[PDB]
Design a protein around this ligand. Sequence first.
Ligand SMILES: *[C@@H]1O[C@H](CO)[C@@H](O[C@@H]2O[C@H](CO)[C@@H](O[C@@H]3O[C@H](CO)[C@@H](O)[C@H](O[C@H]4O[C@H](CO)[C@@H](O)[C@H](O)[C@@H]4O)[C@@H]3O)[C@H](O)[C@H]2NC(C)=O)[C@H](O)[C@H]1NC(C)=O
Ligand SMILES: *[C@@H]1O[C@H](CO)[C@@H](O[C@@H]2O[C@H](CO)[C@@H](O[C@@H]3O[C@H](CO[C@H]4O[C@H](CO)[C@@H](O)[C@H](O)[C@@H]4O)[C@@H](O)[C@H](O)[C@@H]3O)[C@H](O)[C@H]2NC(C)=O)[C@H](O)[C@H]1NC(C)=O
Ligand SMILES: *[C@@H]1O[C@H](CO)[C@@H](O[C@@H]2O[C@H](CO)[C@@H](O[C@@H]3O[C@H](CO)[C@@H](O)[C@H](O)[C@@H]3O)[C@H](O)[C@H]2NC(C)=O)[C@H](O)[C@H]1NC(C)=O
Ligand SMILES: *[C@@H]1O[C@H](CO)[C@@H](O[C@@H]2O[C@H](CO)[C@@H](O[C@@H]3O[C@H](CO)[C@@H](O)[C@H](O)[C@@H]3O)[C@H](O)[C@H]2NC(C)=O)[C@H](O)[C@H]1NC(C)=O
Ligand SMILES: *[C@@H]1O[C@H](CO)[C@@H](O[C@@H]2O[C@H](CO)[C@@H](O)[C@H](O)[C@H]2NC(C)=O)[C@H](O)[C@H]1NC(C)=O
Ligand SMILES: *[C@@H]1O[C@H](CO)[C@@H](O[C@@H]2O[C@H](CO)[C@@H](O)[C@H](O)[C@H]2NC(C)=O)[C@H](O)[C@H]1NC(C)=O
Ligand SMILES: *[C@@H]1O[C@H](CO)[C@@H](O)[C@H](O)[C@H]1NC(C)=O
Ligand SMILES: *[C@@H]1O[C@H](CO)[C@@H](O)[C@H](O)[C@H]1NC(C)=O
Ligand SMILES: *[C@@H]1O[C@H](CO)[C@@H](O)[C@H](O)[C@H]1NC(C)=O
Ligand SMILES: *[C@@H]1O[C@H](CO)[C@@H](O)[C@H](O)[C@H]1NC(C)=O
Ligand SMILES: *[C@@H]1O[C@H](CO)[C@@H](O)[C@H](O)[C@H]1NC(C)=O
Ligand SMILES: *[C@@H]1O[C@H](CO)[C@@H](O)[C@H](O)[C@H]1NC(C)=O
Ligand SMILES: *[C@@H]1O[C@H](CO)[C@@H](O)[C@H](O)[C@H]1NC(C)=O
Lengths: 171, 172, 171, 317, 321, 317
Amino acid sequence: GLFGAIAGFIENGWEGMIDGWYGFRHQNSEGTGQAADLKSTQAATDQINGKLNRVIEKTNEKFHQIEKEFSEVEGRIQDLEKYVEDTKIDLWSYNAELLVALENQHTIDLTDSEMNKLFEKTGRQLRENAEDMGNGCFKIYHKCDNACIESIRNGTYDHDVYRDEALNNRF
Amino acid sequence: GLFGAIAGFIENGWEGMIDGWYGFRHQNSEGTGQAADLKSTQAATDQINGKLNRVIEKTNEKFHQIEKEFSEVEGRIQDLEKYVEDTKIDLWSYNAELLVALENQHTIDLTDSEMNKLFEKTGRQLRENAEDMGNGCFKIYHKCDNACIESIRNGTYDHDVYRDEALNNRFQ
Amino acid sequence: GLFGAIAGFIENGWEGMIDGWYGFRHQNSEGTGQAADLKSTQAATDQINGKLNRVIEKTNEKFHQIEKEFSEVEGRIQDLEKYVEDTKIDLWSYNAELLVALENQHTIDLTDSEMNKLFEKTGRQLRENAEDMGNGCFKIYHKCDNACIESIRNGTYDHDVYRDEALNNRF
Amino acid sequence: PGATLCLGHHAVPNGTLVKTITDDQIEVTNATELVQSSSTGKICNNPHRILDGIDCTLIDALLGDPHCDVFQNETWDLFVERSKAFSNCYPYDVPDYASLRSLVASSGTLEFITEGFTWTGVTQNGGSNACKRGPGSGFFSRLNWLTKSGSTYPVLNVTMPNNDNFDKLYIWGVHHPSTNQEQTSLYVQASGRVTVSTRRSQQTIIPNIGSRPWVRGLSSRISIYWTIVKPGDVLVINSNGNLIAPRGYFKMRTGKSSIMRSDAPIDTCISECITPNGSIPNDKPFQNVNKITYGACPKYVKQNTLKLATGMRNVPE
Amino acid sequence: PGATLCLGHHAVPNGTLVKTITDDQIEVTNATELVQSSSTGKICNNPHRILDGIDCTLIDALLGDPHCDVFQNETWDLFVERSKAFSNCYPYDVPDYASLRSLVASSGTLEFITEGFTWTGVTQNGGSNACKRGPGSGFFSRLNWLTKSGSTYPVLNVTMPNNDNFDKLYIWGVHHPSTNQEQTSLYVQASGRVTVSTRRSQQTIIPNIGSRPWVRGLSSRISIYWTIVKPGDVLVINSNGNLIAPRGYFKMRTGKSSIMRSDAPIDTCISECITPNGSIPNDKPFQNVNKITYGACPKYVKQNTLKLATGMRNVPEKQTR
Amino acid sequence: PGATLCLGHHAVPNGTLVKTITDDQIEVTNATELVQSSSTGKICNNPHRILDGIDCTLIDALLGDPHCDVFQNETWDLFVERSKAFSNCYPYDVPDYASLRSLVASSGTLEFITEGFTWTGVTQNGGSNACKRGPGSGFFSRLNWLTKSGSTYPVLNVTMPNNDNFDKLYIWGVHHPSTNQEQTSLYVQASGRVTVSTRRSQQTIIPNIGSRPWVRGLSSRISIYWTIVKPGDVLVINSNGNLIAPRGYFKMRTGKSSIMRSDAPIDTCISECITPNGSIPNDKPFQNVNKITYGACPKYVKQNTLKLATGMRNVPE
Ligand SMILES: *[C@@H]1O[C@H](CO)[C@@H](O[C@@H]2O[C@H](CO)[C@@H](O[C@@H]3O[C@H](CO)[C@@H](O)[C@H](O[C@H]4O[C@H](CO)[C@@H](O)[C@H](O)[C@@H]4O)[C@@H]3O)[C@H](O)[C@H]2NC(C)=O)[C@H](O)[C@H]1NC(C)=O
Ligand SMILES: *[C@@H]1O[C@H](CO)[C@@H](O[C@@H]2O[C@H](CO)[C@@H](O[C@@H]3O[C@H](CO[C@H]4O[C@H](CO)[C@@H](O)[C@H](O)[C@@H]4O)[C@@H](O)[C@H](O)[C@@H]3O)[C@H](O)[C@H]2NC(C)=O)[C@H](O)[C@H]1NC(C)=O
Ligand SMILES: *[C@@H]1O[C@H](CO)[C@@H](O[C@@H]2O[C@H](CO)[C@@H](O[C@@H]3O[C@H](CO)[C@@H](O)[C@H](O)[C@@H]3O)[C@H](O)[C@H]2NC(C)=O)[C@H](O)[C@H]1NC(C)=O
Ligand SMILES: *[C@@H]1O[C@H](CO)[C@@H](O[C@@H]2O[C@H](CO)[C@@H](O[C@@H]3O[C@H](CO)[C@@H](O)[C@H](O)[C@@H]3O)[C@H](O)[C@H]2NC(C)=O)[C@H](O)[C@H]1NC(C)=O
Ligand SMILES: *[C@@H]1O[C@H](CO)[C@@H](O[C@@H]2O[C@H](CO)[C@@H](O)[C@H](O)[C@H]2NC(C)=O)[C@H](O)[C@H]1NC(C)=O
Ligand SMILES: *[C@@H]1O[C@H](CO)[C@@H](O[C@@H]2O[C@H](CO)[C@@H](O)[C@H](O)[C@H]2NC(C)=O)[C@H](O)[C@H]1NC(C)=O
Ligand SMILES: *[C@@H]1O[C@H](CO)[C@@H](O)[C@H](O)[C@H]1NC(C)=O
Ligand SMILES: *[C@@H]1O[C@H](CO)[C@@H](O)[C@H](O)[C@H]1NC(C)=O
Ligand SMILES: *[C@@H]1O[C@H](CO)[C@@H](O)[C@H](O)[C@H]1NC(C)=O
Ligand SMILES: *[C@@H]1O[C@H](CO)[C@@H](O)[C@H](O)[C@H]1NC(C)=O
Ligand SMILES: *[C@@H]1O[C@H](CO)[C@@H](O)[C@H](O)[C@H]1NC(C)=O
Ligand SMILES: *[C@@H]1O[C@H](CO)[C@@H](O)[C@H](O)[C@H]1NC(C)=O
Ligand SMILES: *[C@@H]1O[C@H](CO)[C@@H](O)[C@H](O)[C@H]1NC(C)=O
């Protein structure tokens, strides 16, 4: 994708993550753990539901049309009836092929984008108390107990609290 | 949008900004103020004007065609004339629907992109003399009088000048 | 482009770079030099080959159709034959115009994206041992001999090795 | 001693392939199918009124072939013609059969209103052994085979104004005898003619005498024609022989009615979309079942599958 | 004592909803309408040459129904047929009416060149009280009703070569009398025939005797036919009765000409695009006014509105209100 | 003493302009052309079977105009009709010429099977000086001009059943004499008639006597008709004059065959796509050469050029 997170600087997905699309894995003093991020998951699924509902908007109700199969050779009028239908079918087949290609390219790019957005949001939360390892992981330069992790994950992490501790561990 | 600035890390727009699409608000020693950024505004409006002029390029002129309303029941030939026109109309209606959907998605993403570009450009100007608060605002760690702000805004800010002052205010 | 690298914060291209699409120029103790980055170049060309092969997939083969030129005036049936073909041609001409416009916009954006990806990847490699000048160049705050440059370029640069040296030169 | 915080995304062990701008096949966590490629094999009897033709074509039900008399009172949204249908009355052709079939199918009714045509100086109600009714000879129920009375067939000249607010469809014909002997025997005059007209239009038909292949005992034929009369217009029929006369008109409507050729059985179920293969669901925007459809249907395309990605790129561990 | 520098974007108090890939309605600062959904109700008289048919169909002007004589030799880019038009001459039909109307409409001219046909041994210039021209009986101006001279109607056999470098359109007809008495009274022979041919094509029409509905005093009819003669080809007309003869030919052209059914009045203004509802502007790429159009027109679509976003996403400051 | 590491991208001195969503002209490093706008001017003789009509229309080869005898039994994927083609046999017309031409072109064969019609009491093999074959008078090879034997032309009444498992195409005609003298001289009866029928169809044609313009010595004409006979059906031909009889039937096929009007010469080369201007390559998805095409062809569009970007934005030094 265009943002380079999914199948990019993040090496792979997590098969073990079943309660969300994006999230967090950590190691601290108290061990390891995993939690889904609801907001980013929601932003992706809401966008995909949106496009899904636009694509399947029932738009086509037709009754009496032209004949499209013929039991007899007739020449000119039948050549035209067939050519009309064949033309229509090719144009719609093209529309269908293009639509899915554009939609799918965009779905890959928007999901990649939401991964990237969560990563940039986290980095911004952490200010000078952490560094980007470059593989989707932050090294946090202070004691971050399970309460501190949940604070990063649920948006309540005050960086000033740990700043001096972290600044000294970094420099 | 794809970049996460507009309706993302920037909480909302400024109704008070009427002379530009993107810009700067500041607080310093001398108070507060607002200025439009012309370059980013121009990049967005130029792109939107471009797509608008592509979409309204007049490109069809038709004269004698087929009949499309009929006062008599005729059967086969009339079934075909109607089916041809109905087919055409549905295909063009689809084209129109897709076009606006793609254009509009792209317009939202390109405007989001220009916001993000301005933000990354500013952050780069400021080097180590400032930190990203994460809400579209930089905390600048030195005395930045109105001259210093205009220097950031008009591209002339020398970061080396204030670096020692700022480095010391940032690290303790 | 959407990422702001090509024709953005990178002022211009390098006509002298002929062995790759993206790459590195350096200045150190031992002089100046240039090398192509193969990975980023490959990611762009693979994507462009992909779209090129999708666009030129031969997809229509037609045999007996309708007549499209006429030596006699006939009226109603001929009006319809011509209108059918004119309709088809306008629709396909529209498809062709839109296709190239979307493809080209996307090709510009994906190439811009790969430039940006390489730049973010490099910045991450360098950790605290360098600063972004804002014009596509990193100022590296330590002695980086030709071996050290090739290490950055070929992915083997250990930042911890030079960190103290660089941290002190920066602060 | 600090901490590590890793950002990531989900994956599944078995993803699905989709197409994009740049890739013919790329793996995503999930996708949904946009092309309906299957059918139950049955035509659902709701919500559209389905009329099964069984042994009858629409045209045979219209003319009133005896084995099709059961269709006289009938209406439909979709008339279904079966491949086993057969004709079993006077041998006939319809120049522009396809148009007559289409316009009747589209009208959606065989509602027939008898009119008191006065046919002075001819014998009415001719019948044939090719078109049996009961123990005797018979004919199309909606047509009136006129022949000589005594030794004369005078010029027939009748009118019927349309003072209703709907269009009237008149079905009539011309008899093509196999020999001169039969022409003069039935109609006196050596050459017939049928002229049927309205204020602005006319059809004039000359009968054709000659031997044809035998069908149900006969080398003669009837050719069937039609005339629509609009409100305020008038029908005139003029003939000095070979007229197969209308008994009345069919009341025309406009609406959603059509016709389909299919051998699929009809079933008690609900489906908006009908194809000759049977009903299909319409939750998907495209279908590859049949280009012939009726109702609220997905659009026909050539691809048998098209996957819309409903998740991110799948990068398993 | 530091400083804060906040980056941002504008918002507007009154945004508009647009559609995207992911949202059927989302708010942007501004948008522009791509579907033309209104008309003035009037057909602009420029830049296309508009010919108002008034009381006449194109076919009646072609044949030369007397109340249509003012249309002799007219030209048009667009002939406009009105719902009040009426015929007031000999009752007629045209098999393939639609095709004749189309080809004449498309040619864009009724320019007529009289030719010196020699009709030996018949009476020319027949007239009827169903087709009054001034106070007395008359006929279609471009047709010549031939009847017997004395007590005979000989076999007519005439030729007209096309030695010009343009195509000639000939309009001719066949008379269908209502009774045998009328047939023999006018043409002597009990059954007429009209054969009109060129080198490669031929049309033979047999008249049919019988009543049709009474129109302006008559149960007889004329059926109208046409024949195009190319440069170097030759017209031959052969008949022993019931010929309604051409007086000449119409000059055919090719170009931008057409025909439209409309009751909209014609007005002094400028518009490239014309619909039956009236002229419409063509600054937008789509329109929902009418699928019938003439000129440089937006393409017809079913949607009555489509909004192209012309600005960013509109994000007002949320209020506690 | 540090170091600088600059990231960058390539540029070229001479870029190309392309179109995007936002720009009608913007410069990229490279692009490729999507519209085929040129041709060799020649029709490649492979891989499609090309049959050059030379001086003959398909219809003249079908009927068997003598200068077209070389086309007897030919087959084609594409029959090519030249603007220099001429007719040189009895003057004729075909009502619905375009349909007959189309259906034969599409069948792809002129394979003709002679059948033993018995024409009792008439003279066969009539000829004309307008249709010379060798030095003497002749006729269309697939048609049999029947005239009187002695002083009589009896009613002809013959049958040919279709007991094969394929459809038969019969070509037949009607002679239109210029004078009464010619009519009675050739057919005795003052007015002919031709009735050709199957179980399901019948065509009856009355000849029309009169002058037409002179072509190759003649003011008379032949009108050409056709009848398809399906397996199990039967042809019946009934006539008391003016019959131009079939000698047999054409075998019909279905497949990829067509016809094209072109003056482009045929060459020994390989091209899937053929236009009247000549063969064109099919590596590009679009073409602006001709809307008339045959084979695996790019789709016709109005643009003469469309550039697909194959590289990044070009920002030279
Ligand atoms: C074949 O059958 C039809 C139907 O029976 C028949 O046509 C009818 O003939 C009469 C007499 O020609 C027509 O009557 C006319 O009707 C109109 C109104 O629509 C009146 O304007 C006419 O009235 C004036 O003229 C009369 C002279 O005939 C005067 O007696 C009268 O006082 C008025 O001045 C006139 O009554 C009638 O319209 C037609 N109907 C139709 C549907 O055509 C036709 O004549 C028959 N043909 C033969 C050869 O028998
Ligand atoms: C002109 O030629 C026509 C064709 O030869 C003549 O028509 C033939 O006339 C005879 C006697 O009148 C008919 O005899 C009947 O035949 C049926 C059989 O019907 C069909 O069944 C078999 C299959 O079982 C099928 O293969 C045949 O082809 C038949 O179509 C008998 O059962 C009856 O008893 C009856 O006698 C012929 O059927 C008929 N042939 C055709 C092809 O129509 C016609 O009489 C001649 N006209 C004149 C005026 O002389
Ligand atoms: C936001 O978009 C709307 C379009 O929906 C813009 O409104 C349009 O703006 C111009 C005025 O600058 C109008 O064009 C002018 O029209 C007059 C006559 O009406 C003509 O004399 C001028 O030469 C010119 O063509 C246009 O009519 C108007 N349309 C509507 C429907 O309001 C609006 O200006 C845009 N706002 C911003 C801030 O860009
Ligand atoms: C009906 O009228 C037409 C035209 O007046 C007659 O057709 C013409 O017939 C003559 C022969 O009688 C043709 O003349 C011939 O021309 C060739 C050269 O083209 C010449 O070498 C011969 O010596 C011969 O004179 C003439 O071409 C032909 N004209 C047309 C326009 O077709 C027709 O014969 C008349 N029939 C009756 C019964 O009145
Ligand atoms: C332009 O004219 C068309 C056709 O006359 C109008 O659409 C018709 O309006 C009737 C109202 O009774 C509708 O019920 C029909 O569905 C329409 N008829 C046809 C033939 O489409 C149309 O509304 C007019 N548009 C404008 C902008 O004036
Ligand atoms: C292929 O042949 C067609 C048919 O002749 C050419 O089209 C003609 O050329 C010019 C426009 O290009 C016009 O003056 C003619 O009127 C065109 N005729 C028709 C019927 O369209 C076409 O240009 C040729 N193209 C090439 C590449 O040879
Ligand atoms: C990459 O760079 C180093 C140091 O310049 C070089 O010696 C080495 O061979 C290269 N590759 C690997 C995989 O170490
Ligand atoms: C895949 O997508 C469809 C449509 O959104 C959904 O109904 C289905 O539950 C999804 N499957 C999985 C395994 O999540
Ligand atoms: C049609 O309706 C009438 C009157 O209601 C009825 O008597 C007659 O039997 C019906 N015909 C059929 C075929 O059901
Ligand atoms: C439906 O019927 C058509 C024609 O009989 C057949 O070719 C087609 O494959 C059928 N498709 C399905 C899915 O049953
Ligand atoms: C019509 O035009 C022709 C030739 O241009 C002319 O001879 C004829 O008299 C004209 N008639 C009228 C009424 O203008
Ligand atoms: C453009 O296309 C191909 C590379 O894929 C090559 O043949 C050609 O030389 C390229 N031109 C330039 C200027 O890069
Ligand atoms: C036409 O077809 C077959 C050969 O398969 C044969 O009956 C007949 O003689 C052939 N004639 C010619 C001229 O090839």
